Amino acid sequence: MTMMDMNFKYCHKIMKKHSKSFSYAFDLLPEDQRKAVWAIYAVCRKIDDSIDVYGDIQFLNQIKEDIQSIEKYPYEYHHFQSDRRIMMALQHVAQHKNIAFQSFYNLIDTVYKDQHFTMFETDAELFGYCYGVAGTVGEVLTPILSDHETHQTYDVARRLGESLQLINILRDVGEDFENERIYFSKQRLKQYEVDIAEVYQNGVNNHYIDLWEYYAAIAEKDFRDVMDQIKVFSIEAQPIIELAARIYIEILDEVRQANYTLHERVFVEKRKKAKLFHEINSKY
Numbered sequence: 001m002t003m004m005d006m007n008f009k010y011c012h013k014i015m016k017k018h019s020k021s022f023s024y025a026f027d028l029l030p031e032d033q034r035k036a037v038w039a040i041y042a043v044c045r046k047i048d049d050s051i052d053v054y055g056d057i058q059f060l061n062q063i064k065e066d067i068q069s070i071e072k073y074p075y076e077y078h079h080f081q082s083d084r085r086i087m088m089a090l091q092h093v094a095q096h097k098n099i100a101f102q103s104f105y106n107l108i109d110t111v112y113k114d115q116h117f118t119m120f121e122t123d124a125e126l127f128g129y130c131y132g133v134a135g136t137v138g139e140v141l142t143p144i145l146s147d148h149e150t151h152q153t154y155d156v157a158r159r160l161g162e163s164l165q166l167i168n169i170l171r172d173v174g175e176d177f178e179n180e181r182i183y184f185s186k187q188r189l190k191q192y193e194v195d196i197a198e199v200y201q202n203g204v205n206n207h208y209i210d211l212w213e214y215y216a217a218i219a220e221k222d223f224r225d226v227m228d229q230i231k232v233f234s235i236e237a238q239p240i241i242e243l244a245a246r247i248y249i250e251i252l253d254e255v256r257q258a259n260y261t262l263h264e265r266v267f268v269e270k271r272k273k274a275k276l277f278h279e280i281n282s283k284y
């Protein structure tokens with residue numbers, strides 16, 4: 001085990017802990033590709049959690065300066081300000097892959113903004129947020145998951161990211177509400193006559209279910225479009241990306257099965273993930 005192995009194993013630990021689904025799928029990649037995914041994923045996770053370290057932007061600005069160091073001097077030795085292990089691994093990735101740094105910076109700006117969170121007026125703003133927080137992650141992963149990147153590769157990977165985020169939102173309505181977040185748009189909440197606080201207090205009803213299903217059908221159509229364009233990705237990543245996605249699409253059924261509850265986080269059992277992999281592994 002080298003020092004660099006240790007940095008990657010740490011990145012792996014961050015990804016497994018926070019997402020058993022993506023870990024389950026992406027750990028099936030060939031060794032150099034999965035390690036690159038762990039490092040990008042861990043960086044993104046550190047960005048998402050940065051504000052809560054002290055309670056302000058300090059740690060986030062240090063991550064950003066780390067990433068800028070890597071971009072400007074990819075082969076120089078850096079004394080990293082934030083998480084050294086993760087930044088050494090990201091730097092190692094960047095020496096082998098064309099990383100879209102502006103995509104990390106977009107993610108970072110979305111985090112800064114999310115400090116003065118106000119609800120989205122319209123769905124267009126919600127979809128902007130899904131880009132910021134998750135389409136950006138798809139962009140950064142693109143060179144890892146595909147042999148030759150075109151605008152279409154980025155477009156697909158970006159749409160996949162945003163569709164996964166929409167599914168997250170639909171899974172976490174109640175938990176987000178507790179943390180003073182609602183991600184459904186004001187336009188759409190008014191249209192369907194739905195008040196999240198009221199639903200959190202009194203349970204689901206037909207209006208909420210219609211609103212929830214409105215968004216679920218968006219996520220599902222987007223997912224179908226990604227699946228139909230799966231060939232943009234490397235041959236080894238295709239089944240894995242299909243699995244990651246299918247596991248996530250299954251979250252929607254878990255929600256309906258639990259009657260759209262706002263008081264627990266539903267999940268797709270590990271044994272179910274393995275069933276979907278069998279279904280897919282056959283096709284490939």
Ligand SMILES: O[C@]1(c2ccc(-c3ccccc3)cc2)CN2CCC1CC2
Binds near residue numbers: 134135139157165
């Ligand atoms: O977990 C994030 C994420 C979302 C989407 C993809 C993705 C994965 C594969 C392809 C495209 C995107 C990765 C990570 C990272 N972070 C901000 C948003 C969510 C929650 C915390």
